[PDB]
Amino acid sequence: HWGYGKHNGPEHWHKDFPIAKGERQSPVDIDTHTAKYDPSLKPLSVSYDQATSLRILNNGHAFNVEFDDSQDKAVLKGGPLDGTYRLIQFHFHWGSLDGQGSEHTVDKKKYAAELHLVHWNTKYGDFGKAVQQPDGLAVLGIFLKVGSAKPGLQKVVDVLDSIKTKGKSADFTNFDPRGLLPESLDYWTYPGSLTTPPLLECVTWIVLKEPISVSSEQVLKFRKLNFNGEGEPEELMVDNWRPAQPLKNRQIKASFK
Ligand code: NI
Ligand code: NI
Known part of the structure; x- marks a missing residue:
């Protein structure tokens, strides 16, 4: 009943989810000249040394690399955030x-x-409770451009053949998400949504200014995934992005001058 086709794509979602036309929807265009430096921001803290990846899943719209979020093993703190957010x-x-x-x-x-690294606020106990709160989630967003390969991405790319179709999963232990980060943690932030x-409307977005580079071959492997299940007609998993939504009564803040 939803996807990324003409018949069921972003422009239809509001019929089932009227929040689609709400006051704090994502994504947005980041107007770099209008964003304002915010001195009240604290330094970002990404603490991923104890991360425990578990599994990779094709859920029919993307693939998720899932983590053990039953302890503070991989957490985001600081920046605009109050409290501790656990990577899921x-x-x-x-x-x-x-x-x-x-x-x-x-x-x-x-x-x-x-790239979206999704975290939930531990004051709410679990992810499902967190998404019901205005400050429930923190999503670290990282742009990808095509150029040199990203070495820390290759382990992800090479398992994608095993999860081609919707509902397939594979074990995916011992992956280090630190290998997906750019050098700088400078960012823009604003309140938004899934x-x-x-x-x-539960997300504090933290979008890094510096992109990471991936190779042609790496992105091409993303594009070989399928939206469909095995034994259904093949539809390549591409263009699984929602376009920019109206900023409305929001200001985007920058962590840097
Ligand atoms: Ni559906
Ligand atoms: Ni996302």
Whole structure:
């Protein structure tokens, strides 16, 4: 009842999820000239040394690399955040062509893909309770451009053949998400939402300014995944991004001058 086709894509979602037309929807265009430096921000702290990856799942819209979120093993703190946010999964959004695929844009520029590291606020006990809160989630967003390979991405790419179709999963232990981060942690932040149904307005977005580079071959492997289940007609998993939504009564803050 939802996806990324013409018949069931972003422009239809509001019929089932009227929050699609809400006051704090994501993604947005980041107007770099209008974002303002915020001195009240604290330094970002990414603490991923004890991360425990478990599994990779094709859920029919993306693939998720899932983590053990039953302890504070991989946590995000600081920046705009109050308290501790635990990493639950990461996934990507990507295009059919290198010129589109990101959900956020920067001065209207689209990247080839966007990495989302999803974290939930431990004051709410579990993810399902967190998504019902305005400060429930913190998503670290990282743009991908095509250029050199990203070495720390290769282990992800090479398991994708084993999860081609919706509902397939594979063991995915001992993956280090630190190998997906750029050098700088400079960022933009704003209050927003999930970008997939149910579109809940529960996310503090933290979007890094510095993209990571991946190779042609790496992105091409994303594009070989399928939205469909095994034994259904093949539909390539591409263009699984929601376009930019109205900023409305929000200000985007920058961590840097
Ligand atoms: Ni459906
Ligand atoms: Ni996402």
